[PDB]
């Protein structure tokens, strides 16, 4: 159930597909995200992705297949997210993240990014 | 030994980093070690030279852990740590680090980490 494969599925079927209807499928209602010093609870997180998943943004994801760590109900890994906007130069961000699960859904993420997504 | 990685990481942070003891780099790190950190990639020799120069500086270190965020697996650990750096007469900087460490026979063989704010723009470290 909880595995690298499940975290990878969230990236592919929610982020890359920009499918806001799957936020609640992959994320626990008590989810909290920590990203580069910011903390967001589930509803802010969901409203934010749903607003972005409505724009003309596009996502591509690369995985570092050497960096995975898989424990019962927790995964850590290293990925690169490349973000494209209409006619704009694409930007690539490296993300290292820890995902802790509750009842098969993501309950906590702790992540940091380089260069920080704060101003991409 | 494969499930001891958290404890070895803690000891490295205490006996090598906070103590600024460059003699222990060869003890805690595999000779084939490679570090990936905020866009830098360093093999063992360059990593060891870089940290020798750090530890010869006036920097001081403090380490805290997020005990909720550990991930442990055979020969692997990921964690969330805060590294506070300071130099005399300078405001300290507290850097949040998410790191993944892979071990070979009790020695660190790979680290992948990203930090916020990036340590590479911290004045105490921008020399590195």
The DSSP-derived string for B1-51 is -TT-HHHHHHHHIIIIIITT-GGGHHHHEEEEEEEEETTEEEEHHHHHHHH
CA distance A76 to A7: 9
Q: Does residue B126 sit within a domain?
A: no
Residue B72 maps to which CATH number?
A: 3.10.450.50
Selection from B52, B49, B126, B50 nearest residue B93 by Cα: B126
Instruction: Check if A67 contacts B (Cβ < 8 Å).
Output: yes
CA distance A91 to A120: 7
Point out which residues pair with B82 in neighbouring strands. Answer: B64, B96
Q: Does residue B71 sit within a domain?
A: yes
Sign of CA dihedral A90, A57, A15, A112: positive
Most A CBs within 10 Å: which of B68, B78, B122, as the mutation test of the A interface?
A: B78
Q: Do B96 and A71 touch (CB under 8 A)?
A: no
Q: Do A96 and B96 touch (CB under 8 A)?
A: no
CA distance B44 to A15: 36
A78 contacts A67 by C-beta, under 8 angstroms: yes
Q: What are phi and psi of A110, to 5 degrees?
A: -120, 120
CA distance B61 to A116: 23
CA distance A88 to A84: 7
Between the two ends of chain B, the Cα-to-Cα distance in Å is: 33
Is B9 exposed, middle or buried (CB count within 10 Å of its CB: 0-12, 13-18, 19+)?
buried
Q: How many Cβ atoms sit within 10 Å of the Cβ of residue B121?
A: 12
Judging contacts by C-beta atoms under 8 Å, the chain A residues touching residue B116 are: 36-37, 112-113, 116
Inter-CA distances, B111 with A22, B36, B38, Å: 32, 6, 11
| Minimal CA separation from B67 to chain A, in Å | 12
The structure was resolved experimentally with X-ray
B99 contacts B37 by C-beta, under 8 angstroms: no
Is A61 exposed, middle or buried (CB count within 10 Å of its CB: 0-12, 13-18, 19+)?
middle
* Chains A–B, number of C-beta pairs less than 8 Å apart: 74
Q: Do A98 and B68 touch (CB under 8 A)?
A: no
Instruction: Check if B67 contacts A (Cβ < 8 Å).
Output: no
Instruction: Check if B111 contacts A (Cβ < 8 Å).
Output: no
Selection from A79, A94, A68, A96 nearest residue A3 by Cα: A68
CA closest to B121 among chain A residues: A115
Domains of chain B: total? 1
Residue B91: domain span: 5-121
CA distance B22 to B45: 12
Instruction: Check if A91 contacts B (Cβ < 8 Å).
Output: no
Of B69, B73, B96, the CB nearest to A37: B96
Is A7 exposed, middle or buried (CB count within 10 Å of its CB: 0-12, 13-18, 19+)?
buried
Resolution in angstroms comes to: 1.9
């Amino acid at each position: 159930m909880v595995s690298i494969a499940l975290l990878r599925e969230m990236f592919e079927k929610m982020v890359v597909a920009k499918n806001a209807e799957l936020i609640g499928h992959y994320y626990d209602p008590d989810f909290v995200m920590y990203s580069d010093g910011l903390r967001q609870e589930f509803a802010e997180f969901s409203e934010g992705h749903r607003k972005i998943y409505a724009s003309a943004i596009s996502y591509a994801i690369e995985y570092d297949e050497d960096a995975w760590v898989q424990a019962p109900d927790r995964v850590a890994g290293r990925v690169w997210i490349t973000t494209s906007r209409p006619g704009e130069k694409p930007t690539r961000i490296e993300v290292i993240l820890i995902a802790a699960y509750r009842d098969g859904r993501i309950h906590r993420i702790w992540e940091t990014t380089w260069p920080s997504w704060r101003n991409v």
